[PDB]
Design a protein around this ligand. Structure first.
Ligand SMILES: O=C(O)c1ccccc1NC(=O)N1CCc2ccccc21
Ligand SMILES: [Cl-]
Length: 134
């Protein structure tokens, strides 16, 4: 018995795995990759019913989106991509699908050992983003 509300709270990055390779796959330039690779974002996740809000905060940039689960919406990512996106909660994991310019990326968010595991995949390049509850 798992629900999207299990992901709510305030989270802080504690481990990164393959993030540079994921940014390279997005085409992010060297300057922003150096900036991105030193950030330790803080994330606040809230979900009232099906209305979900994720606000990501760091010393470099603050980003946030609000959406209804299962309903598509437009999101401008931290690296500047204007994407068509939908979020679905399925099998104890929040699934975010991003499309832009004929390219796809999937971002999954799930709890593992109490840590929020964020997996970003694009063109078979997998990035793992580990957050601790604060
Ligand atoms: O970083 C992440 O784990 C992340 C995971 C999934 C989706 C977006 C992410 N990143 C993000 O939303 N932001 C906002 C500001 C900032 C600065 C530096 C690196 C990242 C970010
Ligand atoms: Cl996140």
């Amino acid at each position: 018995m798992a629900t999207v509300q299990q992901l709510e709270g305030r989270w802080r990055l504690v481990d990164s795995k393959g993030f540079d390779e994921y940014m390279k796959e997005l085409g992010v330039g060297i300057a922003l990759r150096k900036m991105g690779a030193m950030a330790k974002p803080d994330c606040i996740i809230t979900c009232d019913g099906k209305n979900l809000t994720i606000k990501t905060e760091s010393t470099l940039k603050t980003t946030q989106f609000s959406c209804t689960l299962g309903e598509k919406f437009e999101e401008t990512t931290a690296d500047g991509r204007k994407t068509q996106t939908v979020c679905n909660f399925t099998d104890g994991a929040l699934v975010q699908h991003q499309e832009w310019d004929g390219k796809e990326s999937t971002i999954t968010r799930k709890l593992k050992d109490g840590k929020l595991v964020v997996e970003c995949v694009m063109n078979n390049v997998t990035c793992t983003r580990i957050y601790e509850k604060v």
